[PDB]
Amino acid sequence: AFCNLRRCELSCRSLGLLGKCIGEECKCVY
């Protein structure tokens, strides 16, 4: 099961920040 990092970056760009895949899950960081 991929954490889909290139889909994560989009979802964090809606906040205005980068997406990181860590512990098999997408999370955004300021």
Side-chain angles (χ1 to χ4, degrees):
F2 310 121
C3 61
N4 294 309
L5 178 61
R6 304 196 175 152
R7 310 187 196 185
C8 180
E9 282 274 38
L10 321 189
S11 187
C12 305
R13 198 50 51 195
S14 297
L15 313 183
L17 38 137
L18 76 90
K20 182 193 292 281
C21 169
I22 185 169
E24 329 307 330
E25 173 158 17
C26 169
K27 190 177 75 185
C28 314
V29 293
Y30 285 86

